[PDB]
């Protein structure tokens, strides 16, 4: 029942390291993914790894999305929702236009560009879940 | 060949922790850096740490970069390439203009602002790698 300095081994129990830790190989945490059309044609694709979610914006705006409006087709599921509101800044292909989408703790995303009805929104990044 | 609750030690083998782990000090993962001029004057500066790449956009647009065009001066090296397309949102100094640059799995980056021949692109963030 002891951890060795060699060998592939499984270690159970809550382990607290009070000092510094270095990992020369990979460090793998559990991962989960989800994607859905938030609303107005906009898709959000998420991958959760520990306390960080990686996001990617996809789809094409296909209907009128009012300024400051809730995206009501799909909410972000609870396990991907942040503790604090996040503002994900994206860009519209082909011009100089930026927008942001907020993700509140409820997962009901909100559009912060102006009223828009067309264009291709993109952007990759992260947000914390706390 | 046993790990102890005190002392500095090196530990080989794949170790799987089934419980929760706390690290009170620093947690250091492998790191490698790279920077280069993708094309048209644009610089991309990268640092990989584990499965995340930290990027910053630099340089000055100094030749005509067509909308949706490949940046063919330098590719992102294979070891920094993502598994799938990433869209890095940036901002042009001095005004309200935004753009994005895509990094596909090949590392041949593409410009998604409009056709441009001047300006100062900037932006810091992360994207994932395998």
């Amino acid at each position, epitope marked *: 029942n002891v951890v060795h300095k060699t060998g592939d081994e499984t270690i159970a129990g809550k382990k607290t390291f009070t000092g510094n830790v270095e990992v020369n190989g990979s460090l793998t945490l559990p991962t989960k993914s989800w*994607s859905g059309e938030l609303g107005g044609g906009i*898709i959000l*694709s998420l991958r959760k790894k520990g306390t960080t979610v990686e996001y*990617s914006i996809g789809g094409e705006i*296909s209907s009128s999305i009012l300024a400051n409006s809730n995206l009501v087709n799909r909410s972000v599921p609870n396990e991907f929702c942040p503790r604090n509101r996040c503002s994900l800044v994206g860009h519209m292909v082909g011009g100089w236009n930026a927008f942001h989408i907020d993700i509140p703790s409820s997962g009901v995303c909100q559009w912060f560009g102006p009223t828009a009805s067309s264009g*291709t929104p993109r952007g990759t990044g992260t947000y914390p879940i706390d | 060949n046993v790990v102890h609750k005190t002392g500095d030690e090196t530990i080989a083998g794949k170790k799987t922790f089934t419980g929760n782990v706390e690290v009170n000090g620093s947690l250091t993962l492998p790191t490698k850096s790279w920077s280069g001029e993708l094309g048209g004057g644009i610089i991309l500066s990268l640092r990989k740490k584990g499965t995340t790449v930290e990027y910053s956009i630099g340089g000055e647009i100094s030749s005509s970069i067509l909308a949706n065009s490949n940046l063919v001066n330098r590719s992102v090296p294979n070891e920094f390439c993502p598994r799938n397309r990433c869209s890095l949102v940036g901002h042009m100094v001095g005004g309200w203009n935004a753009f994005h640059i895509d990094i596909p799995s090949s590392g041949v980056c593409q410009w998604f602002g409009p056709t441009a021949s001047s300006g100062t692109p900037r932006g810091t963030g992360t994207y994932p790698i395998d």
Partner: nanobody
Amino acid sequence: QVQLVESGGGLVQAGGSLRLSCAASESTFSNYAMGWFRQAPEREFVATISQTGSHTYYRNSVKGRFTISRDNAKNTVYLQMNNMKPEDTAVYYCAAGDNYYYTRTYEYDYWGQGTQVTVSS
């Protein structure tokens, strides 16, 4: 890891139906999201489907009329087009890429030869 062979468009009169097919030689077909694009100068997405068929995405003008589906056991993607309209006339292309949420031609990596689809009256 895909070579795409598309088939078989044709002539259909308005309100009619047509099924397009796109097959890959390789069993690695299941590793790709598939998309149908059409070009009446520039190619627009029509419908996309994820690797396992779990997610699909449509252009608003084809919603409720077109269905994209896949049979991974047969390395084939389909586009069932019902209640066809003259604005559906174009050469249709199937494409393979890494994510169904992409809608632009350059976001896909492998392409079929294209098949002509004409809707009249």
